[PDB]
From a paper:
We determined a 2.8-Å resolution structure of the 70S ribosome of Cutibacterium acnes by cryogenic electron microscopy and discovered that sarecycline, a narrow-spectrum antibiotic against Cutibacterium acnes, may inhibit two active sites of this bacterium's ribosome in contrast to the one site detected previously on the model ribosome of Thermus thermophilus. Apart from the canonical binding site at the mRNA decoding center, the second binding site for sarecycline exists at the nascent peptide exit tunnel, reminiscent of the macrolides class of antibiotics. Unlike the ribosome of the Gram-negative bacterium Escherichia coli, Cutibacterium acnes ribosome has two additional proteins, bS22 and bL37, which are also present in the ribosomes of Mycobacterium smegmatis and Mycobacterium tuberculosis. Sarecycline (SAR), a third-generation tetracycline-class antibiotic with narrow-spectrum activity toward some gram-positive bacteria, including C. acnes, was developed for acne treatment.
Using local refinement on the 50S subunit and the head and body domains of the 30S subunit, we generated better quality maps of these regions at resolution 2.9 Å for the 30S head, 2.8 Å for the 30S body, and 2.6 Å for the 50S subunit. Compared to E. coli, bS16 from C. acnes has 65 amino acid long C-terminal extension, which binds to uS4. C. acnes-specific interaction between bS16 and uS4 connects the bottom and the top (the shoulder) parts of the body domain of the 30S subunit, which undergo conformational changes during translation upon binding of elongation factor Tu and tRNA. Moreover, bS16 in our structure interacts with the A454 of h17 of the 16S rRNA. Flipped A454 binds in the pocket formed by the conserved domain and C. acnes-specific loop of bS16, and anchors h17 to the protein. Thus, we hypothesize that the mechanism regulating the clearance/unplugging of the mRNA entrance, as used by C. acnes or hijacked by the virus in human cells, is conserved. The N-terminal C. acnes-specific extension of uS17 provides additional connectivity to the network of aforementioned proteins and the 16S rRNA regions. In C. acnes, the N terminus of uS17 interacts with the major groove of h9, unlike in the M. smegmatis ribosome, where it binds between h7 and h9. It became evident from the unassigned, strong EM density that a helical protein is bound to the 30S subunit deep in the cavity between 16S rRNA helices h27, h44 and h45. The short 33 amino acid long protein, annotated as AURKAIP1/COX24 domain-containing protein, was the best hit and we successfully modeled its amino acid sequence into the corresponding EM density. The N-terminal part of bS22 interacts with h44 and h45 of the 16S rRNA at the neck of the 30S subunit, which serves as a rotation point of the head domain during translation initiation and elongation.
Residue numbers in the entry:
A (entry chain F): 1 to 96
B (entry chain R): 9 to 75
C (entry chain O): 1 to 87
D (entry chain K): 19 to 135
E (entry chain X): 2 to 33
Amino acid sequence: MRKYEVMIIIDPTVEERQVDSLMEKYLKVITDEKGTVDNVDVWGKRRLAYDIQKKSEGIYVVVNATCEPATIQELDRLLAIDEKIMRTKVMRPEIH
Amino acid sequence: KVVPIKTVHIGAVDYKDTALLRKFISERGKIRARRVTGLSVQDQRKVAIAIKNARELALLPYASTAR
Amino acid sequence: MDAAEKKKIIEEYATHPGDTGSPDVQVAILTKRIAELTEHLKVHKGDHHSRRGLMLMVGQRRRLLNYIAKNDIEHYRELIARLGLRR
Amino acid sequence: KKNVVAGQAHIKSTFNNTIIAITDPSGAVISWASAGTVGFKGSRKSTPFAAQMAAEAAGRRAMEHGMKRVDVFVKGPGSGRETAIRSLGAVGLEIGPISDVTPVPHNGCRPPKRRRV
Amino acid sequence: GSVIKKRRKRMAKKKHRKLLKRTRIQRRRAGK
RNA sequence: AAAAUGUUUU
RNA sequence: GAGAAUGGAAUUCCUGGUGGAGCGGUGGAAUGCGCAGAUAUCAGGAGGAACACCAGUGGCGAAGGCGGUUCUCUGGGCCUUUCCUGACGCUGAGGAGCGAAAGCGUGGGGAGCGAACAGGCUUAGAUACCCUGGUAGUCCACGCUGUAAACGGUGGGUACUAGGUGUGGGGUCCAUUCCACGGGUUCCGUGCCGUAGCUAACGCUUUAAGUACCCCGCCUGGGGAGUACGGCCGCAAGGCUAAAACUCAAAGGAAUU
Ligand SMILES: [Mg+2]
Ligand SMILES: [Mg+2]
Ligand SMILES: [Mg+2]
Ligand SMILES: [Mg+2]
Ligand SMILES: [Mg+2]
Ligand SMILES: [Mg+2]
Ligand SMILES: [Mg+2]
Ligand SMILES: [Mg+2]
Ligand SMILES: [Mg+2]
Ligand SMILES: [Mg+2]
Ligand SMILES: [Mg+2]
Ligand SMILES: [Mg+2]
Ligand SMILES: [Mg+2]
Ligand SMILES: [Mg+2]
Ligand SMILES: [Mg+2]
Ligand SMILES: [Mg+2]
């Protein structure tokens, strides 16, 4: 049961509601096995410092979640196999 | 030498926090050297790692190019 | 080795309640670490540096067992009988 | 033929010669010149004067194609970069943000072997 | 070191290796 | 920019 | 250290737009490429490899070595006042493992680079330097090989013997803070200067090449020769072990002019 911080860059065409639905389903797959979710922050739409998949902007999400390594890897593979998220990064701050 | 460049403190690095990373990135978009940024070795390492992460994660440009 | 089973091993191989550094405890800890590293190496056969660490642990445990057997041979027999019978 | 007004310039100056390309901001090249095109050939086409001649020729042809002030991007470890800049200025059209579009690898591909002159 | 010693050993080694190259076939037919 | 060599006196 | 995913720039190739006579290359050239539209320029795509800046005067590793980021797995080091065991230490023939690069085997991959090779130049000749091409290889997986100026040309352990001055890591103390700037102090690294001392000299000098004790490897003039014969190892290349006849009266180290 470690804690991780996942930053998610979602395609800019998303306009609310379905972003929340995606967040809910991914948090569900986290929480199916004892994986508590500490915080979900939606920065919103921001201009990308460079083009990502031909897109100049993106929706930024930060998910602080305490879970198992297998669970976080499975969440990462789900985010990868998804076609609606431009990029994902999984930080594990060793101290906090 | 380098003592006249007084040691600078930053606290938490937090690659999300773009303000410090901008303060330590060069005007061209590069990472400033230690002798010009005035950071300890550990703080400089953390700043460089955070800059690289922000670059890969689109919070910072790989090179600002034209000014 | 999240310190939980490490403390468990220390307490169930200690000679007396305060014991945490006697050769028996050291050999038990080293054997558990050798087993774990053997599994890790079976997963990653290419980890030569970790294999060298494993060999260092093996030699250290061997010297500890040699000391134990030089002092008390029956105690050495009981310890190794608990710990994998020295095959 | 057609008046492009704005346009832009690309000044590729290498150790061997200099090439000037006046292009539509869409990237389509309007006119171009090089030391080889304007007279010089071989070793003597690396000189800054060759870049001067080529730059002024390209600028003139772009002028009778009807092209006003230029934004310029320069590239390459040549010697005729600045001289070509002056040349465009002398032929006469407002020069804007001189760039540094020259590429730089992040190690990337291996460079060729060191010469043993 | 005067490098002359290394050059002498270099030439001896290179000559022997050339001999091995030229007599490679005979050695494997009958010998080392 | 490449541009080699220098028998046996007494 | 191992595994997996993944980021951006650059090169090359591909497709398209634009545009037209050269491009490229050198000491100078030519081979070469290019009106069948190159070079250049913009857009889109494919692919392999290496990770600018951070980055050295630095870190880590037994050595060889190790630099995009993230996660997973894992080794060792350092410090600490208490705590535990109570000499359990050191070294280590033979043996075993690890061991840059090149090389080898099977399969994959192949952008760039590039032995061999082809051509152009230079030349008395040029089986070279330089230029244009360019295959193995470089890359990956699994093995093999086991050698390097694998060098600090300095085996490991320990104790002692002026200092001065940078720097990396962990503590702890102080004043203003109630951060940190600062100074100290302590333990472990890593450089430079330098005393005693040592050395043929150069130089080394608390990281010894000083003063000592323990264990291992090794040397006994230069060639012949790390060669032959034999044996072992290897798929091969070769590696390891290792002479003698004969021959010379020098070979060599540092330094001086
Ligand atoms: Mg691998
Ligand atoms: Mg550098
Ligand atoms: Mg150094
Ligand atoms: Mg006691
Ligand atoms: Mg061996
Ligand atoms: Mg290799
Ligand atoms: Mg191969
Ligand atoms: Mg093959
Ligand atoms: Mg060549
Ligand atoms: Mg070496
Ligand atoms: Mg040696
Ligand atoms: Mg030894
Ligand atoms: Mg010693
Ligand atoms: Mg020291
Ligand atoms: Mg000596
Ligand atoms: Mg031999």
